[PDB]
Design a protein around this ligand. Structure first.
Ligand code: MBG
Ligand code: CA
Length: 145
């Protein structure tokens, strides 16, 4: 029914600080994002990364799936910091999602884009236009469905 991105191997990957963490935040904690009702939300699966980050996945041999789905936001390990980022999703060189500026307490966003007839998925986490300081971006429950 679904395959998580952390169960797949990227073609290429980069991160601005530390290393990309599969099923964990940048600092190796459970991925947490700010909920819509004041809560801290935990995600068992996903990708923890840091601005500036770019990750590219091939969708070859994955024709079973209709959508790419993920939550995005500043990882809540960095709550109450200078954290400021944006998330961009690309499918075949076309931008299909842009989060805009997200800071420490910005409510998580919920991505769902159709992947039929698509070959390449690209994830971008940018630095909010100031610096990469505190810029822990997490992709919560990142999967193909
Ligand atoms: C001075 O703040 C630090 O900035 C770094 C990026 O340069 C990382 O985000 C660290 O987690 C953060 O604590
Ligand atoms: Ca920033």
């Amino acid at each position: 029914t679904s395959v998580y991105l952390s169960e797949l191997e990227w073609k290429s990957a980069s991160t601005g600080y530390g290393e990309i963490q599969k099923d964990a935040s940048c600092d190796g904690n459970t991925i947490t994002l700010k909920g819509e009702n004041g809560e801290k939300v935990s995600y068992d699966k996903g990708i923890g990364t840091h601005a500036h980050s770019e990750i590219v996945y091939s969708l070859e041999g994955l024709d079973y799936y209709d959508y790419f789905e993920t939550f995005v936001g500043v990882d809540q390990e960095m709550a109450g910091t200078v954290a400021s980022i944006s998330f961009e999703v690309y499918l075949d060189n076309e931008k299909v999602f842009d989060s805009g500026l997200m800071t420490g307490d910005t409510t998580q966003k919920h991505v769902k884009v159709p992947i039929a007839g698509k070959n390449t998925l690209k994830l971008v986490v940018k630095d909010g236009g100031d610096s990469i300081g505190s810029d822990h971006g997490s992709f919560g429950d990142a999967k193909l469905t």
